[PDB]
Amino acid sequence: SIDQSVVISEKFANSIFAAVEHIKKQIKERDSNYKAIIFAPTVKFTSFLCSILKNEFKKDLPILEFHGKITQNKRTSLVKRFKKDESGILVCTDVGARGMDFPNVHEVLQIGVPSELANYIHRIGRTARSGKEGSSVLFICKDELPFVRELEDAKNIVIAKQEKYEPSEEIKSEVLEAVTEEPEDISDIVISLISSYRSCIKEYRFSERRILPEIASTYGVLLNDPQLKIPVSRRFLDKLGLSRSPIGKAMFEIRD
Numbered sequence: 159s160i161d162q163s164v165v166i167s168e169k170f171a172n173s174i175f176a177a178v179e180h181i182k183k184q185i186k187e188r189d190s191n192y193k194a195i196i197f198a199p200t201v202k203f204t205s206f207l208c209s210i211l212k213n214e215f216k217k218d219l220p221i222l223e224f225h226g227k228i229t230q231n232k233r234t235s236l237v238k239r240f241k242k243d244e245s246g247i248l249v250c251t252d253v254g255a256r257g258m259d260f261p262n263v264h265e266v267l268q269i270g271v272p273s274e275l276a277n278y279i280h281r282i283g284r285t286a287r288s289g290k291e292g293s294s295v296l297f298i299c300k301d302e303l304p305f306v307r308e309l310e311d312a313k314n315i316v317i318a319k320q321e322k323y324e325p326s327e328e329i330k331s332e333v334l335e336a337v338t339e340e341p342e343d344i345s346d347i348v349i350s351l352i353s354s355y356r357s358c359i360k361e362y363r364f365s366e367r368r369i370l371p372e373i374a375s376t377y378g379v380l381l382n383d384p385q386l387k388i389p390v391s392r393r394f395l396d397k398l399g400l401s402r403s404p405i406g407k408a409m410f411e412i413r414d
Contacts, residue, residue, distance in 0.1 A: 171379040174207070195265075200350040209337075211247060252273050260287075266282055273354075337380055341381060374410070
């Protein structure tokens with residue numbers, strides 16, 4: 159069946175670098191004969207993740223962006239294309255996972271956790287549908303580990319292959335050099351992640367006080383300044399409902 163594994167980083171942002179080096183290695187070892195699907199938590203992050211992969215890999219493989227605000231016409235034509243292609247990377251949200259049958263995928267990658275436990279199962283079921291071998295890799299940070307524990311408890315799913323990861327400065331520079339986003343765009347993306355993760359904190363039994371600062375600090379990581387907090391307005395923080403809440407001060411800076 160599906161050969162499952164997990165790559166555990168110290169920081170959420172490191173999962174980005176982990177995915178990049180893994181992909182780099184697969185492109186090398188397979189001589190660009192590589193067809194893969196990578197799942198992500200939000201639309202904005204999918205677009206971002208897609209921007210990076212285009213910058214890194216456009217010379218080697220096609221990169222296709224698939225999510226829930228895309229028109230049905232465009233969905234079908236992109237499905238048609240990825241069905242036909244011998245290689246390429248489909249970057250998507252939980253928009254897929256169900257029903258779609260994509261032949262000869264070598265690997266399924268996941269950055270971070272799904273919106274529900276069962277969606278882990280649907281995600282991985284996109285490969286190994288018509289006799290082929292296949293692997294799956296879950297890229298998470300230390301503070302997401304209770305999810306893996308929850309897989310054993312609720313679904314009896316034990317992922318045997320587990321390893322730790324720390325990125326080199328070389329890969330960090332390579333990835334950061336490919337980030338073309340302005341600060342306002344990085345802010346939008348990271349805020350989307352915060353909301354997404356915030357919404358599954360209780361369900362997966364995460365510690366909010368550890369995970370949320372860790373997600374927010376990605377803002378500083380991608381802008382190469384790890385003591386930088388996310389600039390926001392008071393009205394906005396109020397909208398989020400964190401205007402009187404601790405933790406938000408550790409994540410955000412009120413430049414209103």
